[PDB]
């Protein structure tokens, strides 16, 4: 007998439940329609604590407070940006958010498996810019191994997990203050 997709999703979430925090190392690539304007495969990290996360990827350091506010520093533009992201925008930068909070918006189904892995498919009940989310997990213990988000326009955001570890994440990792970026331009997008 084998678990439902919902069952596998809730077994995968257990791997991110360390109370003091979880560190995820990954590689990610965005493949744009017709491969025009794609972003190359590169490396990143996510620190999770409760509903908060700190994302390091590309030129960006981003923090989500677990409520409604995303703050991110872009080292290439020298801007500190504060915004109210949509639920879809959060999944696009942190696909594992589908595991850390209750989500009312997606139908769940099992997709064809891989060698030693399972594949869970999530499709929105209401249009939201996302066509499908695909979470890859290890067949032994449902440990997340990767994710792919396909946008309605065909963009593929592909994430490969290269490590999951324990960490003691302090309050300070989930805040960005203007003093920490000499000369930074603050842009309030709220």
Residue numbers in the entry: 0, 27 to 215
Sentences from the paper on this structure:
The IM complex LolCDE extracts lipoproteins from the membrane and moves them to the chaperone LolA. In γ-proteobacteria anchoring is assisted by the receptor LolB, while a corresponding protein has not been identified in other phyla.
LolA from both P. gingivalis and V. cholerae consist of a large curved β-sheet comprising twelve β-strands. The equivalent loop in LolA-PG is well ordered, probably due to stabilizing crystal contacts. The Arg-Pro motif is not present in LolA-PG or in LolA-BU. Instead, they both have a glycine located at the corresponding position (Gly75 in LolA-PG). The equivalent space of the arginine side chain is instead filled with the hydrophobic Leu41 in LolA-PG (Phe43 in LolA-BU). We investigated this hypothesis experimentally by ITC and could conclude that LolA from both V. cholerae and P. gingivalis bind polymyxin B. LolA-PG shows higher affinity for polymyxin with a Kd of 14 µM compared with 56 µM for LolA-VC.
